[PDB]
Structures are given as C-alpha cells and as structure tokens.
Amino acid sequence: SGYTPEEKLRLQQLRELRRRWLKDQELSPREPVLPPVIYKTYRHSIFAFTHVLIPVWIIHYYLKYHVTTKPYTIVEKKPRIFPGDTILETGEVIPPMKEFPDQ
C-alpha cells in the first residue's frame, strides 16, 4: 500500500518547493521598513485625572445644574427613621418604643 515511484517523486519535488517557499516567508533584519514606581503612579495618576475626575466634574455639573433642576428627575427613597432618631431639618425627636417583655 506504499507510494508508487511516481507518487514519491512528485511528493519529493513538491516538498522541495514548499520548503523553499516557507523559507522565503522569513522577514529580513530591516523588515518592516517603517516610516520615521514613579512611572507607575504618574501613569495611574494621569489615568485617574482623565477617566475619573474630568468625567465626574462633567457628570456632577450636569446632574447639579440641568437634571436636578427639573421635577422628579432624581428621586430618592426617603431615609428610614428608627425609634430614637433626631430629625435634622426640624429638630424633632422620635419617641422610643414601648418596653419589651423579657425574652
């Protein structure tokens, strides 16, 4: 079931060409011919400035002077009030709870 002598010779001839072709895909030394911790923090410091501080300035300015100036644009869930709290706006004191049965 081996190759026939003509099959071997054709394969040999193709093999020589394929290897010469593959060799020629190697680049030369001049190719491509192109046309003409401080570093850590500084790179991280410039990144925080451009990608956090400037965006937050813009967003805050936008939320403060354009969005929150319209009704119901930023709606909060009102704070929870527990027995014993003091309200900042009015000074009101929330009475304690009734005394617990021992448990």
Residues binding ligand 3PE (CB under 6 A): 58, 61-62, 66
Considering the complex, state which of residue 28 and residue 38 has its C-beta at the smaller distance from other proteins: 28
| Cβ at position 62, least distance to ligand 3PE in Å | 5
Of positions 65, 96, 100, 101, contacts other proteins by CB under 8 A? 65
Task: Report d(CA 33, CA 85) in Å as an integer.
Answer: 75
Contacts 24+ apart (CB under 8 A), 72-81: none
Of positions 3, 41, 45, 55, contacts other proteins by CB under 8 A? 55
Dihedrals φ, ψ of 39, to 5°?
-65, -30
Q: Does residue 79 bind other proteins (CB under 8 A)?
A: yes
Q: Does residue 46 bind other proteins (CB under 8 A)?
A: no
DSSP letter, residue 26 = S
According to DSSP, the residues that pair with 93 across neighbouring strands are 86
Residues 40/46, Cβ–Cβ less than 8 Å: no
Interacting partner of 54 out of other proteins, ligand 3PE, none (Cβ under 5 to 8 A depending on kind): none
